[PDB]
């Protein structure tokens, strides 16, 4: 039932390296070490035998050559390149395509990863607390602005609001039904999602019937609200996401922060 998924793509946010056909986003040295090495090291620690890797239309054998040569791997990886992806579809269309391969509960983790955290304890929390989703938040730099806002419950630990300030209006707006239930709420500014996602089996029933997901963040975890109307047919446990806070440095790399990760390693 348990299996891990590695999500590979191509970067458009970065300035210089990625535009070349020979070099992909998966194979990039940051601190004299390859990027996908840390993903393989994590999966080896978490104890997973069934790992399947998804790939875009570009780089069909370059990822397969990187997994075989140099890299410790010692695991059977299933690399596939679907043709429905158009870049303008990113990952949700990839998720809707491959669904009969998954037998039970699945873990989604992108290729753009830097990790310095214990892996097994995140898996154990997913297994014990008995819910659909779990996400991780990590602090921004402290050594010598409008970004994004998360809401966290603290006693069971849950997630409610994750929407950014890009298309957000002049005023901060909250709904009453979503506040009256779960009355205590903590809003985070410094804490950021490092793309760690845990998922259950019962997600397979809804992905084939109703296409609603976007960018694997905006309308991925947001369908959870048992509020106001309640109209979408549920799979039978209340649809509820989770969150856990961490101190150590482990975050995403997509923008200008990639140069700061090199400064973090060399110390």
């Amino acid at each position: 039932s348990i299996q891990a998924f590695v999500f590979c793509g191509k970067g458009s946010n970065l300035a210089p390296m990625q535009h070349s056909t020979r070099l992909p986003k998966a194979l990039l040295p940051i601190g004299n070490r390859p990027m996908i090495e840390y993903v393989l090291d994590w999966c080896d620690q978490a104890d997973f035998k069934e790992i399947s890797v998804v790939a875009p239309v570009d780089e069909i054998e370059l990822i397969e050559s990187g997994l075989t040569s140099f890299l410790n791997s010692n695991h059977s990886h299933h690399l596939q390149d679907p043709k429905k992806i158009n870049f303008i579809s990113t990952g949700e269309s990839l998720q809707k395509e491959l669904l009969p391969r998954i037998n039970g509960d699945f873990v989604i983790l992108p290729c753009d990863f830097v990790t310095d955290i214990p892996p097994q304890v995140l898996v154990d929390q997913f297994r014990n607390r008995d819910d659909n989703n779990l996400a991780m938040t990590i602090y921004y730099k402290n050594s010598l602005k409008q970004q994004q806002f998360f809401t966290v419950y603290s006693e069971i630990l849950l997630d409610v609001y994750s929407q950014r300030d890009v298309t957000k209006t002049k005023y901060l707006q909250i709904r009453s039904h979503l506040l009256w239930n779960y009355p205590n709420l903590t809003v985070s500014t410094k804490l950021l999602n490092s793309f760690i996602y845990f998922c259950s089996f019962e997600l397979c029933q809804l992905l084939k019937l109703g296409p609603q997901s976007m960018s694997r963040q905006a309308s991925f975890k947001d369908p959870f609200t048992g509020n106001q109307q309640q109209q979408n047919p549920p799979t039978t446990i209340f649809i509820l996401p989770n969150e856990t806070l961490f101190i150590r440095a482990n975050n995403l790399n997509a923008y200008m922060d990639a140069n700061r990760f090199v400064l973090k390693i060399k110390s």
Binding site: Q120, V121, D124, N128
Partner: protein
């Protein structure tokens, strides 16, 4: 293979009869163990609800899942590596939490069933009949037998009565729920609780959810609540050969007071709960747990305080030792309600020979 030795806290000068250690957070194990066992061991290590009765029911269901998931190898037959795999389960269960008596009778039943079925019948035809038999066995010995305890107690309890209880026994929760709903009496239920586990708190919560007149109290304050009380029900774990009541923590104290203050103690029990191992004091074989549960300062289980106590290893003799399973003295309880209806604890082993 597993983690063994190296234990928190002092070895202790007094009381060192049992193991005080074990795996909470999963690190370095065999990659063949069925995850439903791994779930139950992680459950029972820090469990708040279970107390003797429900532990075996879950253990049976986990076994039923394993047999349903069991596919016989082409080379090795059914009775080849199964019993070794089961021995690995029990050893992992032992590492997490010392087993109950009812668990032992289940294992003994299962090992009898392995010997009964010879490797000659087809695989899918075998396991289909096996799980059906286990289901019928669990129906009879637990669920139906429980219903028999219910009705036996129903005749015994008088109309409009006050009852003081203790623990988190499944049989008694259903007993009182039956009294509140089906029979409709004026039942004042008082619940007592200890420090390591808020078992009675959970029972009272569930009784409140039914809508019962509930008082909630502690061991420290009893000579005030008693001076009111009629029948006292105790959550059985095991009744031994002699007729000593091996049960949870704050049980014997209550048993003593009730014997002293006229109106006595009653105990509901299962025919699977009886053992043949005998003892006379609490020191003999105790279910010891780590003082990590006693670190917290009052109120709830998770509070996380910068309080007064914190050190155990570095402190020059500071044994904050608590026990879980105690022994009530023989004469003090009066009634036992089982599969075979009734019988005083003086009689005790009239079920073990009857089988």
């Amino acid at each position: 293979p597993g983690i063994s030795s190296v234990i928190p806290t002092v070895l202790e000068q007094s009381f060192d009869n049992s193991s005080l250690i074990s795996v909470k957070e999963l690190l370095l194990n065999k990659d063949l163990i069925h995850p439903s066992i791994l779930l139950l061991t992680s459950h029972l290590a820090h469990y708040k609800i279970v107390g003797s009765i429900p532990r075996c029911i879950a253990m049976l269901e986990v076994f039923q899942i394993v047999i349903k998931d069991y596919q016989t190898p082409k080379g090795t037959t059914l009775s080849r590596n199964l019993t070794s795999y089961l021995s690995h389960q029990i050893d992992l269960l032992k590492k997490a939490r010392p087993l109950s008596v009812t668990m032992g009778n289940a294992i003994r039943w299962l090992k009898q069933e392995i010997s009964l079925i010879d490797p000659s019948t087809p695989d899918k035809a075998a396991k289909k009949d096996l799980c059906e038999k286990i289901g019928q066995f669990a129906k009879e010995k637990i669920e139906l037998a429980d219903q028999l305890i219910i009705d036996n107690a129903s005749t015994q309890i008088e109309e409009s009565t006050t009852i003081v209880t203790y623990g988190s026994s499944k049989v008694l929760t259903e007993l009182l729920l039956h009294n509140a709903i089906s029979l409709k009496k004026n039942i004042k239920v008082i619940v007592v609780d200890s420090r390591p586990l808020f078992e009675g708190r959970k029972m009272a919560e569930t009784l409140r959810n039914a809508g019962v007149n509930v008082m909630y109290a502690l061991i420290t304050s009893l000579d005030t609540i008693f001076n009111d009380v009629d029948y006292v029900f105790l959550g059985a774990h095991s009744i031994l050969s002699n007729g000593f009541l091996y049960s949870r923590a704050g049980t014997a104290m209550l048993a003593m007071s009730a014997k002293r203050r006229n109106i006595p103690v009653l105990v509901c029990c299962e025919s699977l709960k009886f053992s043949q191992r005998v003892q006379l004091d609490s020191v003999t074989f105790n279910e010891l747990a780590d003082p990590n549960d006693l670190v917290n300062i009052d109120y709830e289980n998770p509070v996380e305080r910068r309080g007064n106590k914190g050190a155990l290893l570095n402190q020059f003799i500071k044994e904050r030792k608590f026990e879980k399973k105690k022994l009530a003295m023989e004469n003090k309880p009066k009634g036992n309600k089982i599969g075979g209806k009734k019988g005083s604890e003086g009689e005790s082993k009239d079920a073990s020979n009857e089988e």
